[PDB]
């Protein structure tokens, strides 16, 4: 409307609104395809809420970047980035805030730029996609999972969405919206699985015997619907099936610890490389890890079994390394693993 007189106005235009209920540990990058026709030619653009997103895209589209963001902002969601697939390796290295790389219906170009920023060490977690066609069941599961990396920083999340306006949500965005509601209420150390994402339904119905072939190895991480907890993601594993870096909780837990410690220790850079500074470093970490332990994130009912921090002149580094300007800490800390299998054993004996 156009405001002229100081009264009260009445309009009946079609509007929408979503409130931001964000979490700091989930700032995603939504990758879109370079061969797209209905985007602004800016390669990197920043959207803080739903109101700023509908200024640049005033009409409801059907393309995979629009349904990913419309499903993002309706579950809280904070600031987020639209970067085209040929620039996602640059945007992670420039904007310093990104924790998630959400492949919004994108493959084989996000994948080769995912493995670039992981080998450079940018503490991100990727959310990939399953096939848009239906997996048959005679599929030979190693042949389905051959386009994906083997890094512990990613998960696949197969079944595509069929959002209530008819459009198709990429299943990375279904996983990215359950991460937001998990990190706010339960924390980054809790699994994003049993959180109910709303407004979207899976395109296909998946049984238990189908997921049992894919739960090992490279971990498709199904999106299933249940009477009760409706349309949750079902599975919490990564692309590496090791005893260390299985379980998306314990990977995203250390990425939150590694980023928040280096945010606190950047204010101690260019201090004199001396023994009073090393005491001030290891007490800035013990103060962080104690408050993190007492809110349930670490696994141990004593501080000795939960974390250790140590630094010394002949403990972690030598005099040849002091003279180079290096300060070597080493920190070890234990995470909580989720309960993935519940076995009931019934009998007719008392």
């Amino acid at each position: 409307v156009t405001t002229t007189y100081p009264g009260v106005y009445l309009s009946e235009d079609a509007v929408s609104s979503f409130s931001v209920n964000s979490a700091a540990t989930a700032v995603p990058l939504f990758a879109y395809d370079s061969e797209n026709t209905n985007t602004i030619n800016k390669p990197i653009q920043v959207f803080r809420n739903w109101a700023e997103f509908t200024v640049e895209y005033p009409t409801p589209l059907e393309d995979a970047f629009y349904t990913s963001l419309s499903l993002w902002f309706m579950h809280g969601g904070g600031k987020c980035y639209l970067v085209n697939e040929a620039n996602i390796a640059d945007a992670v290295a420039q904007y310093d805030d990104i924790t998630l790389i959400v492949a919004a219906g994108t493959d084989t170009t996000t994948y080769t730029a995912f493995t670039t920023v992981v080998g450079q060490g940018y503490r991100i977690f990727g959310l990939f996609d399953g096939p848009k066609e239906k997996i048959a069941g005679t599929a030979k599961p190693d042949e389905v999972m051959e386009e994906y990396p083997t890094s512990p920083f990613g998960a696949v999340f197969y079944p595509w969405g069929t959002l209530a306006s008819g459009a198709a949500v990429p299943p990375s965005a279904i996983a990215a919206a359950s991460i937001t509601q998990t990190d706010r209420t339960r924390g980054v150390w809790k699994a994003p699985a049993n959180q109910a994402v709303n407004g979207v339904t899976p395109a296909f119905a998946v049984s238990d015997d189908f997921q049992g072939k894919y739960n090992q190895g490279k971990a498709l991480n199904m999106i299933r619907t249940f009477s009760g907890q409706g349309t949750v993601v079902w599975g919490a594993r990564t692309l590496e099936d090791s005893d260390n870096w299985r379980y998306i909780p314990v990977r995203r837990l250390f990425n939150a610890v590694e980023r928040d410690i280096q945010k606190s220790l950047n204010k101690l850079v260019f201090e004199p490389n001396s023994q009073p500074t090393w005491q001030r470093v290891k007490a800035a970490v013990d103060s962080y890890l104690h408050s993190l332990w007492q809110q349930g994130a670490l696994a141990g009912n004593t501080p000795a079994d939960a974390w250790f921090v140590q630094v010394g002149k002949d403990l972690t580094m030598t005099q040849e390394e002091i003279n180079q300007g290096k300060m070597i800490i080493k920190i070890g800390l234990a995470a909580v693993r989720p309960a993935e299998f519940i076995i009931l054993q019934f009998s007719q004996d008392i």
């Binding site: 023994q275 001030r280 290891k282 007490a283």
Partner: protein, 99 residues
């Protein structure tokens, strides 16, 4: 049978005191910036130190300290003393690291 147990540890009340200098009062802008429950809580480290200052012997760590009082000095015309402010802090735990 008598059963004796440790309870829950209560909060430390920490007293720091320094002199009044001609510059700006850094302990004043940290107690003036209170909005009804809001305060920039800081972590305090008090380290027993070498003479030159290049070695920390035993230090005391304080987790989340915020000011609760700031007493101005008592002005007296028949005194020979420094204007000494005395700030009290409310914290939640005190730990000791020894290196």
């Amino acid at each position: 049978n008598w059963f004796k147990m440790p309870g829950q540890r209560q909060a430390p009340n920490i007293t720091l005191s320094k002199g009044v200098f001609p510059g700006k009062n850094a302990m004043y802008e940290w107690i003036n910036a209170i909005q009804l429950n809001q305060v920039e809580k800081k972590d305090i480290m008090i380290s027993l130190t070498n003479e030159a200052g290049t070695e920390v012997l035993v230090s005391w760590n304080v987790s989340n300290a915020f000011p609760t009082s700031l007493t101005s000095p008592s002005f007296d015309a028949t005194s020979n003393e420094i204007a000494v402010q005395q700030i009290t802090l409310m914290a939640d735990r005190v730990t000791i690291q020894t290196a």
